[PDB]
Each structure stands twice: as C-alpha cells, then as structure tokens.
Amino acid sequence: ADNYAATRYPIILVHGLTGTDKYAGVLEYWYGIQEDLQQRGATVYVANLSGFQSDDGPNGRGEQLLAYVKTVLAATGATKVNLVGHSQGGLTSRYVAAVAPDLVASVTTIGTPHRGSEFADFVQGVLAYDPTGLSSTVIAAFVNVFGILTSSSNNTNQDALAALKTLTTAQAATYNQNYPSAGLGAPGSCQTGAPTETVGGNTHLLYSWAGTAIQPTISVGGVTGATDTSTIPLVDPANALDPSTLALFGTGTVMVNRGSGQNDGVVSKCSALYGQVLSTSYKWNHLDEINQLLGVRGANAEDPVAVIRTHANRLKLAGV
Numbered sequence: 614a615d616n617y618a619a620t621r622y623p624i625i626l627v628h629g630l631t632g633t634d635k636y637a638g639v640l641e642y643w644y645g646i647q648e649d650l651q652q653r654g655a656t657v658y659v660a661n662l663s664g665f666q667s668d669d670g671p672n673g674r675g676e677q678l679l680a681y682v683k684t685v686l687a688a689t690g691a692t693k694v695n696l697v698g699h700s701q702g703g704l705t706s707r708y709v710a711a712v713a714p715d716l717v718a719s720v721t722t723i724g725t726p727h728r729g730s731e732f733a734d735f736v737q738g739v740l741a742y743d744p745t746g747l748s749s750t751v752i753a754a755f756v757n758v759f760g761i762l763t764s765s766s767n768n769t770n771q772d773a774l775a776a777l778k779t780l781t782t783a784q785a786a787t788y789n790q791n792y793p794s795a796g797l798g799a800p801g802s803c804q805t806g807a808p809t810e811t812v813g814g815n816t817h818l819l820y821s822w823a824g825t826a827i828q829p830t831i832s833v834g835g836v837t838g839a840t841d842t843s844t845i846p847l848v849d850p851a852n853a854l855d856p857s858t859l860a861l862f863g864t865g866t867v868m869v870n871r872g873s874g875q876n877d878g879v880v881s882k883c884s885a886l887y888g889q890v891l892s893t894s895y896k897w898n899h900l901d902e903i904n905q906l907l908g909v910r911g912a913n914a915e916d917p918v919a920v921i922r923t924h925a926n927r928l929k930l931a932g933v
C-alpha cells in the first residue's frame with residue numbers, strides 16, 4: 614500500500630445501465646476496483662443509482678447522483694468530487710458537473726455513449742415492429758423487475774423504456790443540446806472538445822477513454838464482418854469463461870452493420886469522445902472496461918484495474 618492514487622478530492626465511481634454498486638448485494642459493478650484504489654491511498658465511493666432511468670428529470674439518475682455527491686462531501690468534509698463514469702454513468706456525471714459545477718473537480722468518462730448507441734437504436738427499432746405495442750410493455754416490466762431485484766437497495770425507481778430512449782443516437786443529440794459541454798466536439802464530427810471547462814467560475818478537468826476491441830475487418834456484398842482484437846482468435850479462454858465476450862462481439866457486429874465503426878460492443882469510438890481523450894486504442898469490450906465479468910479479459914486486453922489506478926495518479930498530479 615501507498616498513496617499513488619491519493620487525490621485531493623474524493624473519487625465517485627458512477628455505473629451505467631443495468632447497474633448498482635453491487636448486483637444482488639454480491640457482485641461489484643466495478644469489479645475489484647474500489648479495493649485496488651483504496652489500497653493505493655484513494656478515497657473512493659461507489660454510487661448506487663437506478664439501473665434504468667433517464668439522466669435528467671426530477672427522478673432521474675442525475676438528481677440521484679447529485680444527492681449522493683452531497684452526502685459524500687458531508688461524510689469526507691471535502692468540497693468537490695472527481696466523477697468517474699462508465700457507459701451511461703458518464704452522462705450522469707456530465708449532468709452533475711453542469712447543474713452543480715461548484716461540487717465537481719473533474720469528469721472522466723469510460724465507454725460513455727455521448728452520442729448514443731446504434732445498438733439502442735436497433736433495439737428501439739425492433740420494438741416498433743410490434744403493431745400492438747405489447748412487446749414494449751411486457752419487456753419493460755421484465756427489465757424493470759430485473760432492476761428492482763438486482764439493485765443493492767431494491768430501488769423501485771426503474772424505467773427501462775426511458776433508459777432505452779435515453780441511449781438512442783437521436784435522444785443523445787438532444788441531451789447534448791440540453792446539457793452542452795466544452796468537452797464535446799460538434800455533432801457529427803467524431804471529434805472531442807476541450808480538456809477543461811469553467812462553469813460558473815468552477816474549473817473541471819475533463820477526460821475520457823474508449824474500448825475498441827470490436828474492429829470492422831471485412832466487407833463482402835454490403836455486409837461487414839468484425840474481429841474481436843481482445844482475443845487470441847477463437848481459442849481465447851475469455852470466450853469460454855466470460856459470456857459477455859462473445860455477446861459483445863455479436864452486438865458489436867450489429868453495431869458495425871449500422872455504420873458505427875470500431876466499438877466496444879455497444880459504444881462506438883466516435884460516441885465515446887469527450888474532454889482529453891487519453892486513449893481509444895484499448896483492446897477492450899464494454900465490460901472489460903470495468904474488469905468484468907469477474908476479472909476475465911481476452912489475452913490482448915490491457916489491465917483495466919491498472920488503467921484506472923494510473924488515472925487516479927493522473928488526477929493527483931493534475932491537482933485534483
């Protein structure tokens with residue numbers, strides 16, 4: 614143990630869609646990461662928000678995170694926090710930085726769909742093929758109950774249809790108009806913005822990274838095939854011992870056939886860009902970014918625990 618990850622301001626890790634701090638009170642979303650950071654001197658809290666909600670709205674994840682931030686500040690005596698969000702958690706973190714800029718020192722997003730997900734567009738589109746609409750009602754009930762059962766606090770505020778809509782590309786574009794950020798490039802640019810923002814006189818350091826394990830590698834008769842560069846081809850034991858590996862290869866194949874380009878299975882490189890883009894070259898699928906499932910990753914994947922730990926040191930050296 615040492616103080617490699619000791620930051621001036623407490624770190625809050627912010628989960629995305631489906632999440633909670635601990636699924637069924639047992640499986641950490643951020644697998645082994647709070648422990649690692651704490652062993653290296655960090656003060657780190659893990660938010661527990663609705664797994665299925667919008668980020669805006671009175672009952673949304675953003676207001677939930679804002680309330681949680683205030684409790685962390687009261688507990689630590691600190692005056693600001695460093696927000697580190699995965700997937701939708703990066704959108705939630707942007708919300709808090711925008712509405713309570715005095716309480717935030719930095720925003721880091723990991724695999725965050727700032728421009729939405731072509732996979733959400735796909736799923737929304739699928740539901741439109743039920744002319745009765747009953748598929749939407751039934752599957753929403755199913756997913757909402759999954760959220761209640763797996764939430765560590767059995768949080769009943771779950772709205773799967775709102776969560777799905779939130780993550781579509783059209784809706785994300787609206788979100789970015791409603792919650793603009795100096796850290797974002799222009800819509801349609803596949804570019805980032807500035808590395809910092811100053812909002813109401815409060816400076817925030819802005820960072821991101823992306824996983825791009827899923828690479829488009831062949832085009833034949835209009836159909837695009839992908840390669841999972843995180844793995845030794847086919848035989849990698851991560852394909853056997855982590856069911857998300859092949860699942861995210863499959864969803865990532867749907868993504869590339871909707872024009873996403875390289876992606877992590879559910880978020881494209883372009884969608885993930887925000888602030889100072891530290892890397893988009895990690896050979897990671899979306900769950901590898903949070904050391905999931907249960908620490909299993911392909912042989913070519915970088916160590917995500919070490920990446921996050923090094924980023925805590927980066928924050929420390931930057932003065933937050």
Ligand SMILES: [Ca+2]
Nearest residue numbers: 905906909910
């Ligand atoms: Ca994995």
